[PDB]
Structure formats: structure tokens, C-alpha cells
């Protein structure tokens, strides 16, 4: 189904809104919109460089230069599947929130702390606890079902809590009406242990066919103002957004199975209008639309080289730099970075393929089967040579176009350090019936790590 | 157990037994066809049954579509008509829901004359 | 050809059973094609006899008389033409039926 110009209205910010839309003129726009009428880019993890486990922090801090006007220091705070709860140490850091409470999901130590949480309460000084946590136990969690909500109704202290967040992701295959099960649960906490200035946000991923769009025209009802947020930092590709909502006029106590029949009874599911309007904003509004490409034709955007303010105020009191531990897990060098990692550590490799050929045994397969093993070593760290400390001229290039192939092309020739080997070794490696070219197929999640390694080579460079 | 966790259990379980009946009426409607590209009847029939295979609900904005591309062919447009009709009449009432928006607006239009 | 005919009953015959097991609504719309269904498992023929002794049966209910009718063109109108005569005498005539509006 899937085969555009219209435009929406301490620790300074204001410099970093991100486009809103209200959501009664959007919902007439796609409803008297016509339309009908008859890729896969990831340079956006280039731009995010700090936070180790996850790096959505950034959009975390364009939400809240919505929320910060609109809340006082509220002293509470309640957080539904942060995942290693980066955005909860963002948001508790810019709103000033006291407590913090973490649902997460739990998958059968049994109290799963987040790793994130305490690394930064490691890195800061003495932190004790800082999020309450819940019981652990498989039935407690697993939002969208009744023992949920029960544990979460039975802790809360009966309609406390002032900024309510949910970051559940949503498969692509995920049945429809088990996503609005999740979101009438939501809901239902919402206006039950939600006050009147509470504030909730959560995170919406709509397709087509969906019932998000029904979801969206009931809880508008509830909220007296409710806006449509699309993060810069997020990727153009994905149709994912945070809907934002203030000013709660009321709470009340009905059961989520009522509100998933008003729902289905409401009978909206969406329109391909609105998945091509989200596309076009986040297209027109994204960071890498706002200040440039990353890649470009071979060079690294001068924007990059230095800490952007987004990042600085990330880094006061919160997370780290990710570029090191990443080339600990992508290339094993270490964190001193002096070129004792590469340079003659990728020679030791050469010397064991010096020794390698040793000129009713398992010569014939086993010898292949560790031949290629020492070659994809060499091959991802002579990229790391190039991206790294070497020029950028007529390589980096060519990384980034076999990269985009989804192929890293090692060939073992005069090359670069082939030079420093020995004329004996560099005679063994040549003489052999060795291919002169190895490919090695990339994942979708090693792609990712490198074009992190892309953005701390900026950084390197500087 | 309590009603609400009765209720999502039961629309689970009818999410799965609706899938077995388009698997095996998929099965069924291709054995039958396989013994210009003007589709017809069957032809058309298959093709909303694969959306119904690979998880992707039929939609009135689908239909338009579907009206738009095979446009010049009256003929044609009537097969498709009938079609859907005949999808109205084999799902049961309570799954169209389930289906999406087509055949809860097609259940209630019938034929005037055999 | 007959064992591509018979096989498709078979897995019509599945297809509308788990059908109806979910159903919140005399034999009416599907019930009486899973009746005819049944009736070509066990090599029964379509005859004109039978939809007549049918209609007789049904009488009193014109609603279910139109249910009948109009699964008797489902069953028209899903089989080919080829086919079409190997399933019986009612099937052919049935494909010259058509409806007047949607």
C-alpha cells in the first residue's frame, strides 16, 4: 500500500523544539484530505554518540522543551517500558522530579535494575536506588493485562503521580488489538492515578489499519490540549511519533475493556494520508535535513567534529560518550587509543598468517574454515585504519558505497601494512591460491555500529 | 479469572482460528484456479484472501484503490463487487470486525434478484 | 481432474467448519454450504429434485429461502466452468443467475 509541503505551527533550551501538530486541524486536514491517487537509511545513528545501551536521551530533551512550561517541579513521575531507563535519568535530571517510578517488561536476579540508571549514578557519586522499582515477578509488568494493572492501581498512591510516559515498542507484527489493550491500559492508569496537571506522553507508531487513530480522537476528549510531537533525532524512515497530553480536567475510574469497545464502536482505523503526512514532516524536519548529511561525497560534516549543544547538555550529569566500549565490542581496540590498537596488532594477525600454512589430518576443511575467521578480523579492523586515523580521500568513500551494498571488501595485495611485513612472510601470504579479495555480508545491527563508529571518528578528528 | 483477561483470551483464539480458516480456504481457491490479465471472479477473490495471508486488513481506501487501477473494465469492476460480496457471505458476523471495514459496510447490501 | 475437484471440498469443507465455530449469530447463509459442501463429500449429486424438495422443506421461511438461494451462488459462483457440470445440474443454471444490484 505504501506506493507534501504541508508545514506545522538551568540548561537553556528553546533552541531545540521539534515540530507539533494540534490534533482536531490535523484530524479534519486527513479527513478532508482526498489523497490516494496510485530506502531503509541509517545515517541517524551517526548523529546520536552519546548513551551506551540506548541513545534516544536526545529526543527526550526536544519533549520536555514542551513539558517544562506546563509542570512545576512536581516531586513524581511514573515511566512504562523505559529499557535500561535512559529517558528516565534525562527527564528526571531536566524536570527536577524527585521519584521515579519503572515498569518495564520482565521476561521469565528477578528484580531487573537498569543498567544505564546505574552506571550513571556510578559515574556521578553516591546514588542510592533512585528508581522504586516493581515486584519482578513474570504475571507483575507485562503491560496490557489485568495483574498489571492491578499491581500498578494497588502501589500508586491514589491519583499522585504528575508525568506519566510510555516508550512500549511495537513490533510490526503485533496484533492491533492487543496494542489498544496496552493504550486503554495506559489510559486507564492515566485517569486514575493521574492528578489534574498531569502530563502523559507516549509513544505511537501508527500503520495503516491500525487503531491508533480512533485511540488519538477518544483521548483528546480527556486532555484539554493535545499535540502530535515529531522528534529530529529520530529516523524519517519510521513512523514514530509522541503524543503529548496537558491539563487532565478530571479522574475517573472505568475499566479498560470499556474504552477498547468505545474504541472498536468509534470505528476510525487510520488513513494511508496520515502515515504520508508523519513521513513528510519527519522527512522535512529531520536532523540530518537541518544541518546537512553525515556521509556527503567522502567527507564528514564540520558540524560533527565538535560536541554539539545538544550533546552538552546531555553530558552534564547524564550518560557518556559511547565511541569508547564501541570499538572495544566492533574492533577490540582499546580505550588509551594511542595506535597501539591497529597499526602492528593487525600485523600479529599477518605473522599468525605467516605461520598458518606450516609448508589422515584435517587439513583440507578446518584450515579453511580458520583461514576466513583471521581475514574478517583484518578486514574490520583495516576499516577501522581508514575511518579512524587515516585520510579520508577516495576511502571513506567507498566504505560508505560498499557499506550502503551491505558488503566490507578486504584484499590481500602490496595494500596498506603489507609494506611493514616481512619479504619471506609477504612472499608466503602472496604465494598461496588465497582469493586477493574477501567480502564479508554486514547485519543491519553491525551497520548501525558502524555509522556510530562514523560519528566518533568526527570527533577523533577534531 | 476475572471477565477482562476471559475476553482478551477469547479474542486471541479467535484471531488464531480465523487465520486456519483463510489458510485453508487460500489452499482451497488455488487448487480450484490452477486447473491481457483481465481478472475475473476467482482471480480477483485470491488476492484479498492473500492480503488476509500475510496480515494486512482490508480497508475502504484499498477498495478505492483496487476501483481506481482496474477502471476501463465495467465488467471487471462488477466481478470484484461481487467478489468482496462473496467474502461478506462466507466470514461470519462477529470476525468482520476482525476483517476490517470493507465487509462490515458490504454485510448489509444483498442481491435484489437471483 | 476429479482429485483436483475432491480436494477442494475437502479444504472448503475445513475452512467453513472453523468458521462457524466462531459465530455470534433452520439452515441459513454458510450452514446450508457446509449442508451442500457435505453432500459433495459423500458424492452426492446436484440435482434440480433436491433444490426443489429443499424449497418445499423451507416454505414457510422466505428469510431462509433467500439464505438458500444465496449460497447456492456462492457455490455457483466460486467453482469454475469447466468443473461446473461435474458438480451438478443446479451449478450451470445457477451461473446464468445474476443479481440486479449491489
Redesign the interface.
Known amino acids: 500500500?505504501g506506493f507534501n509541503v504541508s508545514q506545522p505551527k538551568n540548561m537553556s533550551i528553546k533552541a531545540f523544539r521539534p515540530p507539533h501538530d494540534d490534533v482536531a486541524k490535523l484530524l479534519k486536514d486527513i479527513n478532508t484530505s482526498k489523497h490516494?491517487?496510485?530506502l531503509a537509511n541509517y545515517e541517524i545513528h551517526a548523529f546520536r554518540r552519546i548513551g551506551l545501551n540506548s541513545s534516544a536521551c536526545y529526543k527526550a530533551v526536544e519533549i520536555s522543551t514542551l513539558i517544562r512550561r506546563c509542570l512545576e517541579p512536581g516531586e513524581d513521575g511514573l515511566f512504562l517500558g523505559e529499557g535500561s531507563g535512559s529517558m528516565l535519568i534525562t527527564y528526571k535530571e531536566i524536570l527536577k522530579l524527585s521519584k521515579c517510578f519503572y515498569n518495564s517488561g520482565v521476561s521469565a536476579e528477578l528484580a531487573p535494575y537498569p543498567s544505564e540508571v546505574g552506571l550513571v549514578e556510578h559515574r556521578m557519586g553516591v546514588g542510592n536506588i533512585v528508581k522504586v522499582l516493581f515486584n519482578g515477578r513474570p504475571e507483575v509488568t507485562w503491560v496490557g493485562?489485568?495483574d498489571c494493572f492491578n499491581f500498578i492501581v494497588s502501589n500508586i498512591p491514589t491519583s499522585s503521580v504528575g508525568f506519566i510516559h510510555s516508550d512500549i515498542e511495537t513490533l510490526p507484527?503485533k496484533?492491533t488489538?492487543?496494542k489498544l489493550?496496552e493504550l486503554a491500559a495506559i489510559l486507564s492508569m492515566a485517569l486514575l492515578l493521574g492528578k489534574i496537571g498531569s502530563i502523559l506522553v507516549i509513544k505511537l507508531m501508527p500503520f495503516?489499519?491500525d487503531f491508533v487513530q480512533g485511540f488519538i480522537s477518544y483521548v483528546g476528549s480527556h486532555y484539554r490540549e493535545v499535540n502530535l510531537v515529531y522528534p529530529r533525532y529520530s529516523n524519517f524512515i519510521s513512523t514514530e511519533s509522541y503524543l503529548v497530553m496537558t491539563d487532565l480536567k478530571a479522574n475517573r475510574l472505568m475499566?479498560?475493556?470499556k474504552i477498547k469497545q468505545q474504541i472498536?464502536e468509534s470505528?476510525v482505523?487510520t488513513?494511508?494520508g496520515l502515515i504520508g503526512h508523519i513521513l513528510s514532516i519527519k522527512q522535512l524536519s529531520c536532523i540530518q535535513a537541518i544541518v546537512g548529511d553525515a556521509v556527503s561525497r567522502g567527507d564528514i560534516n564540520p558540524t560533527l567534529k565538535k560536541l554539539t549543544p545538544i550533546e552538552q547538555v546531555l553530558i552534564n550529569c547524564g550518560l557518556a560518550i559511547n565511541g569508547p566500549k564501541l570499538c572495544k565490542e566492533l574492533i577490540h581496540h582499546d580505550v588509551a587509543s594511542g595506535q597501539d590498537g591497529l597499526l602492528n596488532s593487525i600485523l600479529i594477525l599477518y605473522r599468525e598468517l605467516a605461520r598458518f600454512k606450516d609448508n589422515f589430518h584435517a587439513y583440507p576443511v578446518l584450515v579453511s574454515s580458520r583461514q576466513r575467521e583471521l581475514i574478517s578480523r583484518i578486514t574490520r579492523k583495516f576499516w577501522g585504519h581508514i575511518l579512524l586515523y587515516s585520510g579520508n580521500r577516495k576511502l571513506i568513500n567507498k566504505f560508505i558505497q560498499n557499506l550502503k551494498s551491505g558488503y566490507l571488501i578486504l584484499d590481500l595485495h602490496q595494500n596498506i601494512f603489507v609494506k611493514n611485513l616481512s619479504k619471506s612472510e609477504k612472499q608466503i601470504i602472496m604465494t598461496g591460491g588465497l582469493k586477493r579479495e574477501w567480502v564479508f555480508k554486514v547485519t543491519v545491527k553491525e551497520t548501525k555500529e558502524w555509522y556510530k563508529l562514523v560519528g566518533y571518528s568526527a570527533l577523533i578528528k577534531d | 479469572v476475572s471477565a477482562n483477561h476471559a475476553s482478551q483470551q477469547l479474542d486471541q483464539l479467535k484471531a488464531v482460528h480465523l487465520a486456519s480458516a483463510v489458510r485453508d480456504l487460500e489452499r482451497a481457491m488455488t487448487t480450484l484456479k490452477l486447473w491481457a490479465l483481465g481478472y475475473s471472479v476467482i482471480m480477483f477473490m485470491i488476492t484479498a484472501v492473500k492480503r488476509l495471508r500475510e496480515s494486512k486488513m482490508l480497508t475502504l481506501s484499498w477498495f478505492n484503490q483496487a476501483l481506481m487501477v482496474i477502471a476501463p473494465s465495467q465488467e471487471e469492476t462488477m466481478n470484484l463487487k461481487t467478489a468482496m460480496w462473496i467474502l461478506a457471505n462466507l466470514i461470519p458476523r462477529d470476525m468482520l470486525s476482525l476483517t476490517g471495514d470493507l465487509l462490515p459496510s458490504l454485510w448489509g447490501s444483498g442481491l435484489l434478484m437471483l
Request: proline share 19%.
Open positions: 500500500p490516494n491517487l496510485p493485562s489485568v507484527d496484533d488489538i492487543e489493550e495503516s489499519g475499566n479498560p475493556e472498536i470505528s482505523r488513513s494511508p
